[PDB]
Chain A
C-alpha cells in the first residue's frame, strides 16, 4: 500500500503544485500512480464539497499516524481567519485538524515555509507559516517560489523510500538540496572572481554572460539547488537566462530591498 498524502492549500498562488508536475525524475505521473496515494488535493481531485471533505475523515482514521500532510500556502490570522475559507470555516482549523494525526508535515514552498508574498509588508491578512501554527509535529521546509520540481519529488522520494525525514539544517530545510548557496557553483562565478560584471541590461558584459551581482543578484546569500540541479530538467536557471537571483528560497526575501539593489560588502562573497 502506498503512503497517503493529504495535500492542503492555504493562501497561495499554486506555483508549488505546478512545479511538482514538471518533475522529470521521477515523473509526477509515476509518483501519483505508483509511489503515494494522493487522496486529497483541491487542484486535481474528482470529488468536491461534501464528498471531498469526507475523504479527510476516512484517510485520517484508516491511516492514523501513517499519512503525510503536505501544505502549500499558509493560514491567515487576520479577518478571523476568514481571508481563507474552506468548508465555511477558517483554513487554520482544517490545517490543525489534519496535522494532528500526520506522521510528517511537508511545508511546500516559501508560502508554507516562511510566508512568501502575502506576508510581505504590511501583511494585510497576517499570513503565518505552518511551523508557527503547528508546533508539535515534525516539519520539513522546502522553500523557494516555487521550489525546483526535482527538489519537491526528491523530498517525497526520500521520505517514501526510508520512512524518515532527511537531515535538516537549522532552518528545517533538507541539506541534500539546500546546503549550497547559488553563488558556490554558479557558472558565472569565474566572472565574479575576475571583477567582470553586467552594469546595465543588455550591455556587452550581459551578452558575454558576466556576473549579475551589480544588477542585484542575491545568489551569494541564497541557499538552493538552482546552480547545479537547475530548472525544468536542467534547462536553465534565473542567472543562466540573464536575471539575478531574487533570493526566492530565503525567509523574508520580499522585504530585503529592491531586487535590483546590489548586496553591500562584495568582499564578503
Chain B
C-alpha cells in the first residue's frame, strides 16, 4: 500500500477481476481491490493487446504511412490518418490548400459526432439504463417525459413509445436476449425510472439507424467509412462544379454533405444533449458524483480547430495543461519539447535501456517484453490475478513534464472554460454550453421533474463520471456547429475561384530533405493524439504514436503515479463487488479504445 497524487492505494482488500471489459473497443482487463464496505481502494488497468504498428512502419514510405496507422483503429477512423499526414507535412514543410484544410476539418468533426453519439448510446448507455425496467414503463408517461426533456424532438407520441416497447417485449420474451443476456438488470446501481429507461432505449434504436447517414460525409470526401482515404499534401477528392459529374466533388455532393450536417445538428440538440442532461440530473440527484480521478487536478489537450489555419492562438478548442486543479493557469503544451511529452515503460510490457526515464516520442522505442511479476497468481498463459507491482500492460505510460494527466472531451472543456475565463474569445461557445448545462442539471430539469434544486458549481460537477459523459455530448454538439460553418467557408472559397485540393510541390521524394522530423497532433474523439516521425533517405526511420487512451489507460510510471482510469475508479462504492456496474460506468466514461492505446 502507498499514497500517490492524493490517493491512498491499498491492495489488502478483496480482489475483483473484470476480463474481458466489454462495451469498449479492443481488449482490456481491469482488477480492483475493495475494502470492507465494497469501496474501491486500488485499481489496475491492463491493456491486453498489441500489434506493433510502430515497428511495422520502419523502412516504409512516409506517403503510405497514413493508411497503416489509420488501421490502428476503426472506431476513431481517420484521426490517425489525419495525424500522420500532418506529421509528414510538418517534416517536409508542406502547406496544404485551404479547401484541403476545410475538408479535413469537416471529416474530423464528423468523426467526433459519430464516435461520441455511438459511444454514448451503444456502449455507455447500458451502464445507466436498465432495459428490463423499460418494459414496465407507461407509454403516456414516457411521452410526457420526452416532451419535458426535449420539446423540439418530434418523435414523442405515446403510440410511438408503445410500439418500441412492444418490440423490446417480444425480443425479451423470445428467451434469446442477445446483447442483453446475463446483464446486471435490477441492480440498485440503476436509479432511472421506467419511463426514462424506455426513452433512452428508444433513442439507442434511433441512433443506430441514424449513425450510418452521418458517415456518408466521410464517404463523399474519403471514398468509404470506415477507413476513408487521406493524402499527404491535401485531399484526393478533386473539385469541379461545371467542366464535372465525373469529379469527386461537385455542388450536388456538397449539397448532400450539408443535408447530413443539418441532420447531425438536430440529433445533437434534440436527442443526445438533452438525454445526457436528463440522465446526469437523475444520477446527480442520487448522489453519484464518483469518478473524477485526475480530472479534478491535471488535464491536457494539444488544442485544435484554429479559426485561421496554421495559427494556433485561434484554436476553437484551445489546449494546454492544467495542474493541481488550478483553472486560473493554463500552461502551454509543445509536442516538440523533449522535456514535455514522455513515455515510461516501467510497468509496461516493453524494454528500454534505462526504464527510470521517459522518452519523448522522437526518441521512442517499442521493443516488446512480455514478462509477469513474482506475485502473479497463475501462469504466463493463465493469469488469475495480475501483479501490478511489476509489468502489467501493453499500454505505455505517457506523462507531461512527469505529471500524470487526463485527456479527452472533459479535459478540453475544462481547458476551454479556463481559457474563456482568462479572456480567450475563441472558447466562448463551450463556456456557454457548460453554464447552460449546469443550470439545466441544477435547476431547470429538477424543477421540471419535481426534484430539489441543487447548487453544484462547474468545479464540482465537471470532475466526475457524470461530467465526463456530459463534456462528450457537448463536444459532439459543438463539433456539429463548427463543421456547419466550415461547409459555408468551403463553398464560399470554391465559388470565389479557389478549387485547389492538393499541394504536390513536394510529392516526389527526390524533392525532400535527406532527413527530417515532424509531428502531427489531433484533438481526437478520446483526447490528445500525436504522431512523431523521423524520415531518412525517403524512408521512415522512426514512427511513434502517443494516443489518447495511451494517456488515460496508462499503467503506473517509474515514480508509481497512477493514470486516469486507475484514479477514476478509486474511492467508488460498489453495490455488489461481483457485478462490475460502477467499474463499467466509470471506465466507459473515458470511451476506452484499447487498439488505439497499444497500436
Enumerate chain A interface residues (CB-CB to B < 8 A). Answer: 1-2, 4, 9, 11-19, 21-24, 27-29, 32-33, 36-39, 41-55, 79-90, 116-118, 120-125, 127, 145-146, 149, 200-202, 206-209, 226, 231-233, 235-243, 246, 248, 254, 258-260
Contacts A42-B22, A118-B56, A124-B52; is A209 near B246 (CB within 8 Å)?
A: yes
Name the residue in A55, A88, A231 with the highest tally of chain B Cβ atoms < 10 Å from its Cβ.
A88
With a cutoff of 8 Å between Cβ atoms, the chain B residues found around residue A145 in the complex are 71, 227
Interchain CB contact (< 8 A) of B238 among A2, A53, A206:
A206
Interface residues of B in 527-572 (CB under 8 A from A): none
Q: Is the CB of A86 within 8 A of B219?
A: no
Judge if B384 is at the interface, Cβ distance under 8 Å. yes
Residue of B nearest to A2 (CB): B176
Interchain CB contact (< 8 A) of B22 among A37, A48, A84, A88:
A48
Judge if B193 is at the interface, Cβ distance under 8 Å. no
Q: Is the CB of B220 within 8 A of A236?
A: yes
User: Closest Cβ of chain A: how far from B552's Cβ, in Å?
Assistant: 18
With a cutoff of 8 Å between Cβ atoms, the chain B residues found around residue A49 in the complex are 17-22, 580
Judge if B205 is at the interface, Cβ distance under 8 Å. yes
Q: Is the CB of A237 within 8 A of B224?
A: yes
Interchain CB contact (< 8 A) of A208 among B123, B243, B381:
B243
Q: Is the CB of B23 within 8 A of A24?
A: no
Residue of B nearest to A83 (CB): B50
Q: Is the CB of A207 within 8 A of B23?
A: no
Interchain CB contact (< 8 A) of B220 among A122, A201, A235:
A235
Q: Is the CB of B67 within 8 A of A259?
A: yes
Q: How many angstroms from the CA of A49 to the CA of B182 in the assembled complex? A: 11
User: Closest Cβ of chain A: how far from B223's Cβ, in Å?
Assistant: 4
Interface residues of B in 384-442 (CB under 8 A from A): 384, 386, 394
Q: How many angstroms from the CA of A83 to the CA of B504 in the assembled complex? A: 40
User: Closest Cβ of chain B: how far from A33's Cβ, in Å?
Assistant: 6
Q: Is the CB of B23 within 8 A of A14?
A: no
User: Closest Cβ of chain B: how far from A89's Cβ, in Å?
Assistant: 6
Q: Is the CB of B63 within 8 A of A48?
A: no
Of the A-B pairs whose beta carbons lie under 8 Å apart in the complex, a sample of 8, sorted by A's number, is: A46-B185, A47-B181, A79-B50, A83-B49, A90-B381, A202-B504, A232-B212, A241-B222
Judge if B444 is at the interface, Cβ distance under 8 Å. no
Q: Is the CB of A21 within 8 A of B248?
A: no
Residue of A nearest to B49 (CB): A84
Q: Is the CB of B221 within 8 A of A241?
A: yes
User: Closest Cβ of chain A: how far from B26's Cβ, in Å?
Assistant: 7
Interchain CB contact (< 8 A) of A207 among B26, B183, B239:
B239
User: Closest Cβ of chain A: how far from B159's Cβ, in Å?
Assistant: 20
Q: Is the CB of B208 within 8 A of A29?
A: yes
Q: Is the CB of A87 within 8 A of B19?
A: yes
Interchain CB contact (< 8 A) of B75 among A14, A118, A226, A259:
A14
Residue of A nearest to B126 (CB): A46
Judge if B240 is at the interface, Cβ distance under 8 Å. yes
With a cutoff of 8 Å between Cβ atoms, the chain A residues found around residue B185 in the complex are 46
With a cutoff of 8 Å between Cβ atoms, the chain A residues found around residue B227 in the complex are 15, 145-146, 248
With a cutoff of 8 Å between Cβ atoms, the chain B residues found around residue A54 in the complex are 182
Q: Is the CB of A243 within 8 A of B51?
A: no
User: Closest Cβ of chain B: how far from A185's Cβ, in Å?
Assistant: 16
User: Closest Cβ of chain A: how far from B245's Cβ, in Å?
Assistant: 8
- With A42-B22, A53-B20, A232-B216 given, name 9 new contacts (CB 8 A): A11-B51, A49-B22, A86-B19, A88-B17, A120-B56, A238-B224, A241-B221, A241-B229, A243-B223
Judge if B513 is at the interface, Cβ distance under 8 Å. no
Q: Is the CB of B224 within 8 A of A15?
A: no
With a cutoff of 8 Å between Cβ atoms, the chain A residues found around residue B222 in the complex are 241, 243
Residue of B nearest to A19 (CB): B226
Judge if B306 is at the interface, Cβ distance under 8 Å. no
Tell me which of B279-287, B329-337, B494-502 binds A: B494-502
Per-position binary interface string of chain B over residues 160-194, scored 1 when its CB falls under 8 Å from any chain A CB and 0 otherwise: 00000001000100101011111111000000000
User: Closest Cβ of chain B: how far from A191's Cβ, in Å?
Assistant: 9
With a cutoff of 8 Å between Cβ atoms, the chain B residues found around residue A13 in the complex are 71-75, 595
Judge if B29 is at the interface, Cβ distance under 8 Å. yes
With a cutoff of 8 Å between Cβ atoms, the chain B residues found around residue A127 in the complex are 51
User: Closest Cβ of chain B: how far from A112's Cβ, in Å?
Assistant: 13
Interface residues of B in 1-42 (CB under 8 A from A): 17-27, 29
Q: Is the CB of B208 within 8 A of A246?
A: no
Q: Is the CB of A14 within 8 A of B26?
A: yes
Q: Is the CB of A241 within 8 A of B19?
A: no
User: Closest Cβ of chain B: how far from A247's Cβ, in Å?
Assistant: 11
Q: Is the CB of A232 within 8 A of B224?
A: yes
Interchain CB contact (< 8 A) of B223 among A11, A12, A231:
A231
Contacts A235-B216, A237-B224; is A32 near B383 (CB within 8 Å)?
A: no
Q: Is the CB of B61 within 8 A of A258?
A: yes
Contacts A14-B595, A201-B502; is A118 near B52 (CB within 8 Å)?
A: yes
Q: How many angstroms from the CA of A41 to the CA of B73 in the assembled complex? A: 17
User: Closest Cβ of chain A: how far from B22's Cβ, in Å?
Assistant: 4
The 7 closest A-B pairs by CB, nearest first: A15-B74, A209-B246, A124-B52, A88-B383, A46-B183, A238-B223, A242-B236
Residue of B nearest to A200 (CB): B504
User: Closest Cβ of chain A: how far from B286's Cβ, in Å?
Assistant: 21
Q: How many angstroms from the CA of A180 to the CA of B402 in the assembled complex? A: 55
Q: How many angstroms from the CA of A37 to the CA of B378 in the assembled complex? A: 34
User: Closest Cβ of chain B: how far from A214's Cβ, in Å?
Assistant: 13
With a cutoff of 8 Å between Cβ atoms, the chain B residues found around residue A226 in the complex are 224
Judge if B55 is at the interface, Cβ distance under 8 Å. yes
With a cutoff of 8 Å between Cβ atoms, the chain A residues found around residue B52 in the complex are 118, 124-125
Q: How many angstroms from the CA of A117 to the CA of B564 in the assembled complex? A: 29
Judge if B310 is at the interface, Cβ distance under 8 Å. no
Interchain CB contact (< 8 A) of A120 among B50, B68, B229, B236:
B68
Q: Is the CB of A15 within 8 A of B71?
A: yes
Q: How many angstroms from the CA of A51 to the CA of B584 in the assembled complex? A: 13
Q: Is the CB of A52 within 8 A of B22?
A: yes
Q: How many angstroms from the CA of A124 to the CA of B123 in the assembled complex? A: 31
With a cutoff of 8 Å between Cβ atoms, the chain B residues found around residue A80 in the complex are 370, 380-381
Q: Is the CB of A201 within 8 A of B216?
A: no
Q: How many angstroms from the CA of A50 to the CA of B239 in the assembled complex? A: 53
Q: Is the CB of B73 within 8 A of A83?
A: no
Q: How many angstroms from the CA of A36 to the CA of B179 in the assembled complex? A: 11
Name the residue in B126, B209, B219, B231 with the highest tally of chain A Cβ atoms < 10 Å from its Cβ.
B219
Q: How many angstroms from the CA of A243 to the CA of B250 in the assembled complex? A: 16
Judge if B53 is at the interface, Cβ distance under 8 Å. yes
Interchain CB contact (< 8 A) of B167 among A18, A33, A88:
A33
Q: Is the CB of B224 within 8 A of A37?
A: no
Q: Is the CB of A14 within 8 A of B25?
A: yes
Q: How many angstroms from the CA of A233 to the CA of B73 in the assembled complex? A: 22
Q: How many angstroms from the CA of A125 to the CA of B60 in the assembled complex? A: 19
Judge if B507 is at the interface, Cβ distance under 8 Å. yes
Judge if B225 is at the interface, Cβ distance under 8 Å. yes
Residue of A nearest to B100 (CB): A202
Name the residue in A14, A124, A202 with the highest tally of chain B Cβ atoms < 10 Å from its Cβ.
A202
Residue of A nearest to B47 (CB): A85
Q: How many angstroms from the CA of A53 to the CA of B29 in the assembled complex? A: 13
Q: Is the CB of A22 within 8 A of B225?
A: yes
Contacts A29-B208, A236-B220; is A146 near B181 (CB within 8 Å)?
A: no
Q: Is the CB of A37 within 8 A of B205?
A: no
Q: How many angstroms from the CA of A41 to the CA of B182 in the assembled complex? A: 13
Contacts A19-B226, A202-B234, A207-B238; is A235 near B22 (CB within 8 Å)?
A: no
With a cutoff of 8 Å between Cβ atoms, the chain B residues found around residue A81 in the complex are 381
Q: Is the CB of A124 within 8 A of B22?
A: no
Q: How many angstroms from the CA of A135 to the CA of B183 in the assembled complex? A: 34
